[PDB]
Amino acid sequence: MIITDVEVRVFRTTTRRHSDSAGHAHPGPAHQVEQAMLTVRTEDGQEGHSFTAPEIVRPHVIEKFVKKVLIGEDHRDRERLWQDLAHWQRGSAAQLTDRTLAVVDCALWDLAGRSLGQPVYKLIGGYRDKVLAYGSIMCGDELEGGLATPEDYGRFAETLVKRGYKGIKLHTWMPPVSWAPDVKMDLKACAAVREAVGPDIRLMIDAFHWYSRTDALALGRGLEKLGFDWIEEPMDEQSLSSYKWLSDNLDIPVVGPESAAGKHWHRAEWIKAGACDILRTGVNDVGGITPALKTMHLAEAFGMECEVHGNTAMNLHVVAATKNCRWYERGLLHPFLEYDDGHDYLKSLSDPMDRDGFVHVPDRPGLGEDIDFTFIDNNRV
Amino acid sequence: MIITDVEVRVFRTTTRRHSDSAGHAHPGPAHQVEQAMLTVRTEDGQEGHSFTAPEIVRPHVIEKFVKKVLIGEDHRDRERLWQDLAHWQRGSAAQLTDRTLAVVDCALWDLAGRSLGQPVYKLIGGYRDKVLAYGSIMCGDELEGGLATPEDYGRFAETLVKRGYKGIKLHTWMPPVSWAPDVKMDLKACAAVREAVGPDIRLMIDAFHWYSRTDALALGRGLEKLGFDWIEEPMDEQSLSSYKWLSDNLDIPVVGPESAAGKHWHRAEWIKAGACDILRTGVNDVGGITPALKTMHLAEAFGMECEVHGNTAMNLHVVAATKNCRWYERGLLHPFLEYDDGHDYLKSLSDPMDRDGFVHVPDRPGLGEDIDFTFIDNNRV
């Protein structure tokens, strides 16, 4: 159907999540944060929606790039439209980002699903209606009883096992935590968690993202003693060669790249060079559901797993449509916060999890985000 | 000295340069364009300045990132400050770009030079006070007598040779030129230029940036028959493997990567994999003078040249401080425009060129941009 409108609505959500100056999430005081909803509408009035930070869909980007590509086009030509946006990034003075591509692609998928009364993963071609989640723990902090000590991680891990998680991923301490980073502290946290949960829970760590080769090597060696299942992004992913070196040295599987640019193209280079043992993708990291699927297929053709970064519907649907991914990433989690409480702007969870640790994909059309339109309207900026 | 202020001044410049929807420059009607000047000031009142597009230094980026890193710090700690910004990019929701790092780093270098009464390339450590420039021709257009036909390129090339350029680089036709791209037309333009200038002028081409492997191969083979000195960015640089393949296949030197992310780190990967025969860097492409110098040094250690993308003082000073770069890129040029007329907001050229094709670096302190502060003040947005 012909796309007639692209609209952004900015509203305030009430949350206890804060992000530090380096972008890491932490629990803090309840406060209002601006959140944006992108809507694509067709001639018959059907809409698709997706959520992102206001800057990613600010008027500069919407007017200069997004509307020019989308308006007047058949909404179903997702490949053509994605490629059109992709070929405009180079000349965009660094303003047309993969994040912008992602929210646009997601809204187009939601539009197609809502139009047809079909969940996105079913339209793609379903693999699984439920999937194991790992509990993805927030970055370390200096909050007493929070994630300040190695024992704090151990205690929280016990809680996650009780909840039903069959896998747990630590994010350890990073600047601006005053004393961070420290390999020995990271390893103490990992050891506390292994001691707490025993050998039959799968454990992963996603550490400070800029350790030197020598520090990441020491971290990896320590993890092998604790039977961890993977090490994630312990070094600057801009150095492919460092990851090749680390993977060759470590027995423990290295997963990546999460944050590196270049979408599926650059991820092929990680396979080619042997820079990782497990690939990584994510809707936000590679510019949408469409390229995330490509990354999943790329990995599958090499007989590799590709673990999907990020919670929310958009990532869950990629995981549900593909086989070669062990988990959905559920979080980030913190003992001070109740993840299962959801968001004020959604009427129900996009990723409810049973007591056995399986997330069940909602049977709602599109991305299945149960949007509280009335709340958004009552809280506009 | 302690940094006390970071300020952005947005002003209108009058220019005939336009950018199409894919970001390519073309000559068009005279119009006003918003330009931004970033200023860093220290406790004693000394200032450094650099220019960029308004979005790159908009309040979001200045307040959330730049001020937090710079304010209260010793202006001379350019390495520490650059690394601080670099380590904040990952968590910036794609808003802290290499372009933002570049303008900040440039302003800091300008500040150090102005404070000491020294040109930046002299502070770095001078290699050459003058350098050969190639005439870098604008992307093709559909303007009669402009760059619409192969013969138009040939005629313009004759003019460039008369001006004194010893080297000429074509940018050929790209979308949204109605019929673009077409390898055979690109090759006709290259042939017209070679016929016009003879065998003793150095010729380069920078083509449509997203040709398939098969098209870029055909382009490269055609260039070999015309004795061209390099082929630049004919394929999506997100595919390192495509560049390894193309370089292995072509006799003509392949230069890159220009636009790929990852700064000097990712450029090391291009050397390691043999993806190019000549490296490429640029102040805007790798996030500043500081990392551009790193890329130059990286290339030199492999006995490679590293050609520096972009005109203006910031790139000229990198070229003047290093040996392993054949040219300064002077342009973009078009028969309808007079490059030597300069900009309304600068009192004189940053890159004047003699009749023998050498650009002479001004002996003015800092980046040596002869800023018309009065004009800027009279034309504020």
Ligand SMILES: O=C(NO)[C@@H](O)[C@H](O)[C@@H](O)C(=O)[O-]
């Ligand atoms: O890595 C992640 N998930 O796996 C994201 O959770 C984050 O960006 C996290 O690593 C961080 O804030 O450093």
Ligand SMILES: O=C(NO)[C@@H](O)[C@H](O)[C@@H](O)C(=O)[O-]
């Ligand atoms: O490649 C360049 N210089 O070499 C820059 O001039 C440009 O981005 C140009 O290629 C373009 O607009 O495609």
Ligand SMILES: [Cl-]
């Ligand atoms: Cl339809």
Ligand SMILES: [Cl-]
């Ligand atoms: Cl249609």
Ligand SMILES: [Cl-]
């Ligand atoms: Cl499963």
Ligand SMILES: [Cl-]
């Ligand atoms: Cl739940």
Ligand SMILES: [Cl-]
């Ligand atoms: Cl509602």
Ligand SMILES: [Cl-]
């Ligand atoms: Cl000083």
Ligand SMILES: [Cl-]
């Ligand atoms: Cl000082």
Ligand SMILES: [Cl-]
């Ligand atoms: Cl802003």
Ligand SMILES: [Cl-]
């Ligand atoms: Cl020279």
Ligand SMILES: [Cl-]
């Ligand atoms: Cl001149």
Ligand SMILES: [Mg+2]
């Ligand atoms: Mg991660």
Ligand SMILES: [Mg+2]
């Ligand atoms: Mg290994």
Ligand SMILES: [Mg+2]
């Ligand atoms: Mg709790």
Ligand SMILES: [Mg+2]
């Ligand atoms: Mg170029």
